């Protein structure tokens, strides 16, 4: 089917814009290596409050009460991170 | 097949989804292995 990510992005921008305690200035649209760093710079603040020994269990109690399974989503993300996709190295631009 | 490093945790996910706490059952089974329970019997079966 032909119903792409823009429908889900329109809901992602809502979940941000209904948590934004509106600033005086706009926010910065990070590139993917500040996204990777922001994830780990935050996880390294979470895991000083919550031990990883109980994390996925406590998350499954909280989110399983709303019908999410975490282990399935993890094993999907393991198979997605094992997937040998497209071969890189784009050719030369326009003219020389 | 299963490392003990994850056993009680995985069992608590599976059986906690059905309403069981393993930690209270273990702490009961610890007290049921520490408890100095009775030796010879008080008088049941009184027609003996």
């Amino acid at each position: 089917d032909t119903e792409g990510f823009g429908e889900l992005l329109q809901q992602a921008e809502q979940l941000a814009a209904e948590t934004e305690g509106i600033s005086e200035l706009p926010h910065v649209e990070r590139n993917l290596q500040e996204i990777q760093q922001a994830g780990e710079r935050l996880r390294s603040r979470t895991l000083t409050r919550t031990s990883q020994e109980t994390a996925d269990v406590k998350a499954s109690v909280l989110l399983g009460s709303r019908g999410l399974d975490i282990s399935h989503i993890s094993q999907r993300l393991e198979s997605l991170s094992a997937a040998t996709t497209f071969e890189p190295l784009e050719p030369v631009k326009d003219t020389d | 097949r299963t490392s003990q490093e994850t056993a009680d945790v995985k069992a608590s996910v599976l059986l906690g989804s059905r309403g069981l706490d393993i930690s209270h059952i273990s702490q009961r089974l610890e007290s049921l292995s520490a408890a100095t329970t009775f030796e010879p019997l008080e008088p049941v079966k009184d027609t003996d």
Binding site: H72, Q75, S79 | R1, T2, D8, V9, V13, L14
Partner: peptide, 18 residues
């Protein structure tokens, strides 16, 4: 803990195939 290590794998096959 063994059955958890299988029952989840069954769901990975199920949401891949149906």
């Amino acid at each position: 803990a063994q059955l958890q290590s299988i029952h989840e794998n069954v769901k990975v096959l199920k949401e891949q195939y149906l």
